[PDB]
Amino acid sequence: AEDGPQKQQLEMPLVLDQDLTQQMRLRVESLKQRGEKKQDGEKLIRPAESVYRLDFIQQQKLQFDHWNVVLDKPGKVTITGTSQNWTPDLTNLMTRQLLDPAAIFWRKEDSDAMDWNEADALEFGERLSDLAKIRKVMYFLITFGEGVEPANLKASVVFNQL
Numbered sequence: 001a002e003d004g005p006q007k008q009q010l011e012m013p014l015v016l017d018q019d020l021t022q023q024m025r026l027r028v029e030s031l032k033q034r035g036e037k038k039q040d041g042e043k044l045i046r047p048a049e050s051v052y053r054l055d056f057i058q059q060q061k062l063q064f065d066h067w068n069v070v071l072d073k074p075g076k077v078t079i080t081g082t083s084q085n086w087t088p089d090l091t092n093l094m095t096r097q098l099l100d101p102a103a104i105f106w107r108k109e110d111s112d113a114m115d116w117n118e119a120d121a122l123e124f125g126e127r128l129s130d131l132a133k134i135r136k137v138m139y140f141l142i143t144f145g146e147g148v149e150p151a152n153l154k155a156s157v158v159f160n161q162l
């Protein structure tokens, strides 16, 4: 097999999850207004982070091909996946539930080309095929650097269908 254009591929977008993001925002706020301490080991959402969602329209016979992360303005974004054991409806995200490594993408000033941490972005992507088997939905925390917001970002993952 030689890698080529005629391969069945599926592109699955990472969609902003407003209500989960809002739920997490509220959580940090409540903790302040009440002067309460966060849970032992909890991950509190920083204002620059937003929760994204990826719905595996197919879970079996998937092979990670590449990331399709694009910024329409110079900037930087970090995409950190979360454990497939974290069910947002049930618990507050734990720091240990953040997957290592994260995929970091950036666009420098006068160039239009994106660049990223190739080795880690690949390692992370390879994991998605197995994570899809655990459940149809997966959550991510996308950290936006200075100058960029969710509106500037278009992220998706491309899998070759086996």
Ligand SMILES: C[As](C)(=O)[O-]
Binding pocket: 017, 019, 020, 023, 088, 089
């Ligand atoms: C925490 As929700 C209501 O985005 O499944």
Ligand SMILES: [Zn+2]
Binding pocket: 002, 003
């Ligand atoms: Zn070859």
Ligand SMILES: [Zn+2]
Binding pocket: 017, 018, 019, 020
């Ligand atoms: Zn939601």
Ligand SMILES: [Zn+2]
Binding pocket: 088, 089
């Ligand atoms: Zn839910």
Ligand SMILES: [Zn+2]
Binding pocket: 115, 116, 117, 118
């Ligand atoms: Zn590079």
Ligand SMILES: [Zn+2]
Binding pocket: 116, 117, 118
């Ligand atoms: Zn590099």
Ligand SMILES: [Zn+2]
Binding pocket: 101, 120
């Ligand atoms: Zn690394």
